[PDB]
């Protein structure tokens, strides 16, 4: 009956954000008791919209969908950091690198938390935790 879900790590790519979703569970439906999948932001939204649209869940409250993380400004700094070379000293590069990492770290902390909380709210809900789409979201693509 147990279901525990969390996000262990994430990667921001040029155009995409991926979250690694970890599940520990004793529920017999799953192939394994501990497993992982990778999920882009989009798929959290698909799962949320599918809950909201499903008439079987009338009378239930669906946890709010996580916002789309915004790395746009940071990606352009990251691209420039690779390119700039031109007369940038090693000391300047190291400092630019250090501040950009801090910039990404904060964005990551917040978006991972909001994505994770969404899933944990689903896993705690006595009805929503049994949704078929949720099982697909947690397990598909081993």
């Amino acid at each position: 009956s147990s279901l525990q879900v969390e996000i262990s790590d994430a990667v921001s790519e040029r155009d995409k954000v991926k979250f690694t979703v970890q599940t520990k569970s004793c529920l017999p439906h799953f192939a394994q008791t501990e497993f992982s999948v990778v999920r882009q932001h989009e798929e959290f939204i698909w799962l949320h919209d599918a809950y909201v649209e499903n008439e079987e869940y009338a009378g239930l409250i669906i946890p709010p969908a996580p916002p789309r993380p915004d790395f746009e400004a940071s990606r352009e700094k990251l691209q420039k950091l690779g390119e700039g070379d031109s007369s940038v000293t090693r000391e300047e590069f190291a400092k630019m690198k250090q501040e950009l990492e801090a910039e990404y770290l904060a964005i990551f902390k917040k978006t991972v938390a909001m994505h994770e909380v969404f899933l944990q709210r689903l896993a705690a809900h006595p009805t929503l935790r049994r949704d078929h789409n949720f099982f697909v979201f947690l397990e598909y693509g081993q």
Binding site: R14, F71, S74, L78, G82, E101, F108
Partner: peptide
């Protein structure tokens, strides 16, 4: 391409980013 990896810190270690 250029990417940033994020690893959540497992108690008590700190969260980490890696520029790649």
């Amino acid at each position: 391409g250029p990417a940033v990896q994020f690893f959540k810190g497992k108690n008590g270690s700190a969260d980490q980013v890696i520029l790649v």
